[PDB]
Amino acid sequence: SGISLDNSYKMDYPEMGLCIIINNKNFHKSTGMTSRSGTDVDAANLRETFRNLKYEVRNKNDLTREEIVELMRDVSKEDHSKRSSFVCVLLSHGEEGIIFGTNGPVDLKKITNFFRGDRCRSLTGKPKLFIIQACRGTELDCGIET
Amino acid sequence: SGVDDDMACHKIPVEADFLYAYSTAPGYYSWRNSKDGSWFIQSLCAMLKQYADKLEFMHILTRVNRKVATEFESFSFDATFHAKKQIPCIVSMLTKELYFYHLE
């Protein structure tokens, strides 16, 4: 054939892929973490947005730290051969490098490591997108007038 | 030649092909409105709805950065938390351009 370029990911597999949305709104009383009012609007907006991009959206609400890890492990062990990409959206409280389950923290590296190129073969070479609504510390940006 | 290029057996990094679309810069709070949702997710959805059939993903996320940065500012009865701003943070380990659409 004619000249070929390889500058964009192949996005015409049979399926665009999964979009896993973890929507943590209510936290166990013993943690003292306040409920995240407004997060259901985000989870609904994301579901609609990714549905129109033809992702298979799976919404999960109020998962413990153990459930988050188990969900990620199980998803990483599916056969993604016929999927172009993978998306995970995390909506929770957080700190730098950490997202909260309803009963305590999960290191973001633990979640993303399941999808490493050597650990999720059917996603090797395919874009893996993690969208994270959570704090990354306690600094405040005062802004500057333009 | 050289010792560290032109390998006979091709590998890629195990950390390649990841993209982390963080709602805020490292070290910072991330803001959420109790009625409308988080500033970042509101803006990300709006830009994907408008531009996913038109722009490469990094360029969509750059519009999300501009929308969050310019259109939102916190309102709080607590002066400590009032009038604050936010910039999201795109962290790309991707190796190719990403378009949500393809040629038919």
């Binding site: 995240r36 609504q133 | 709602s23 709070y29 803001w31």
Partner: peptide, 5 residues
């Protein structure tokens, strides 16, 4: 109302 995460 505004809160943070």
């Amino acid at each position: 109302x505004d809160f943070f995460x």
